[PDB]
Curated annotation (Swiss-Prot):
Glycosylated residues (UniProt): 10, 49, 135, 160, 197, 223, 231, 274, 279, 311, 315-316, 321, 349, 376, 411, 437, 442, 492, 523, 532, 534, 543, 571
PROSITE patterns (alphabetical): ALBUMIN_1, ALBUMIN_2
Impact when changing R112G: In Yanomama-2
Function: Binds water, Ca(2+), Na(+), K(+), fatty acids, hormones, bilirubin and drugs. Its main function is the regulation of the colloidal osmotic pressure of blood. Major zinc transporter in plasma, typically binds about 80% of all plasma zinc. Major calcium and magnesium transporter in plasma, binds approximately 45% of circulating calcium and magnesium in plasma. Potentially has more than two calcium-binding sites and might additionally bind calcium in a non-specific manner.
Gene Ontology annotations for the cellular component aspect, listed alphabetically: blood microparticle; cytoplasm; endoplasmic reticulum; endoplasmic reticulum lumen; extracellular exosome; extracellular region; extracellular space; Golgi apparatus
Key word Signal present: yes
Name of the featured protein: Albumin
Binding site for Cu cation: H1
Gene encoding the protein: ALB
Protein location: Secreted
Phosphoserine found at: S3, S56, S63, S271, S417, S487
Tissues in which the UniProt entry reports expression: Plasma.
Residue positions binding Ca(2+) 2: D11, D253, D257
Amino acid sequence: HKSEVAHRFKDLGEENFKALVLIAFAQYLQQCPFEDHVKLVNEVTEFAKTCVADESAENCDKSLHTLFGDKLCTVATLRETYGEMADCCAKQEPERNECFLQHKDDNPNLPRLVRPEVDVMCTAFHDNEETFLKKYLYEIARRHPYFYAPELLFFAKRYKAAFTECCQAADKAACLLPKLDELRDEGKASSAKQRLKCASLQKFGERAFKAWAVARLSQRFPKAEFAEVSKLVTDLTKVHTECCHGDLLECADDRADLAKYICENQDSISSKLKECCEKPLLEKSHCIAEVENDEMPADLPSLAADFVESKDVCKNYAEAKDVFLGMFLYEYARRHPDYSVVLLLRLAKTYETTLEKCCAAADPHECYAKVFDEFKPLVEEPQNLIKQNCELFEQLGEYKFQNALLVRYTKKVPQVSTPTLVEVSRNLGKVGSKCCKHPEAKRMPCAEDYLSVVLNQLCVLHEKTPVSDRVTKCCTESLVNRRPCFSALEVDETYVPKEFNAETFTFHADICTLSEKERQIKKQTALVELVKHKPKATKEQLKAVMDDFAAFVEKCCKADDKETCFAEEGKKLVAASQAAL
Ligand SMILES: CCCCCCCCCCCCCCCC(=O)O
Ligand SMILES: CCCCCCCCCCCCCCCC(=O)O
Ligand SMILES: CCCCCCCCCCCCCCCC(=O)O
């Protein structure tokens, strides 16, 4: 291991090496032109090949951190452009590396990347495929500076495949656009989880995280023994703790080690882990992370034996409380992959509470029996919600389903901005389209996965612009009571109906030309303002207003004259609706 850079070059390969180096530099030097980074990439690459040919070369023995920090300090416009960051260069390793991480800017001031014309993209993709993909990879990296580089490279390859398919099909846009939308969503979904998980570790501590890890690991690796799960949880915590620090190399090494250990102890962990452990170093940790759940052993008892009817229960618990609780969580999780992680945590928390209570009583054996009865109400709560919402999603369309959620959440928290209500409603609706197509056995985990980011995304916007105390309470409570807290929200009887605005309910003929998406957007916007104006409106009354509006749109988008119809029949529609409500 004379040369870190040479070893990395051999493992990753030239292509991947180039991309990762581009991303790394782009995440630090977020305000340097693309051509600047291309020069850096080529300089580092050629030096790497130097080390590949001879690990005893002049600078090949240097550390990856040292080489990287050295290149950064060679940038001429470094002090002019980044100011304080240039002061890091005066420091010594390893102090210098820590300094560069501190002055890493998160979400700087850059214009939003506008998706160009399909014809323009495919033409550029054809003429200069490399400079086209790399230039965009540079644009994404500089904007999402804390996104794990290898993951960011994972999406880039998928983007390349999307253009390869569609850019030589007759109807390109019909192929490409739906794919680019899928990536954009997954890209921000993956980016949301990453910050959420890192925020959890800092906010609730390692214990709550370990409890979360024990649950999901036991679900994925039900055949694994508790001792094996403990080790995995322990190292998983060490990985995310380091990964959230920000150091790419250190983070990469920890993930690689874990993937290294898991593949070597494959028989001791999971059976459905063969393909992932066959893939290259760059795809190992990624493949394992989202591996399919292994199928649990056929002969599995109930927990009542070791956690209820058994003696020495308090003895074993008091001997090592978190361990014992972890064992309960392990045993319960491996049996219920159909459960959300948080649900298992609620159950474990419940089991914890009773042991603290009953183990102090005269005869603890009694208060044990109470426990498992307490689980049912907690379990069926998320189950009933899923059944009802999916049935609602089945009867009404997704769009109509979004509208239903729209009126519901508007009546619960009318203070929320209209654009925000419209966004979360459409998102929750999309969650319904995705998860409700799963059978019950896999619905709850699916819902947890999507709602977690939607709810945290929601609390983030509320963080910057607070509007409701009730919403703030849910956003600041335990991540196990977050979703339930939101579901506990009732209609706001405090809300004073906002004053009428004619412009808000004035429609023009332009909506007839609007895309099917933004026509819904403007209609859903008007719906939110309608509920905000008269919140005490019933479902029948509202449906009556919505029907008249729907017919009003068809009668003006079907006539010879259009703008006059929207202005005149628009006056009629508004006057008639005001009277009914
Ligand atoms: C001279 C310094 C150049 C810096 C080059 C950065 C190299 C990054 C190496 C990333 C390897 C990550 C391997 C995959 C690990 C994982 O499972 O996530
Ligand atoms: C390998 C052992 C991991 C540690 C297991 C700890 C089990 C804790 C059980 C209580 C659920 C934790 C939920 C968040 C914190 C809390 O509410 O107590
Ligand atoms: C910036 C503040 C945003 C406020 C958002 C108001 C809308 C709240 C929506 C809550 C969704 C709850 C999802 C869980 C399912 C349920 O129990 O209904």
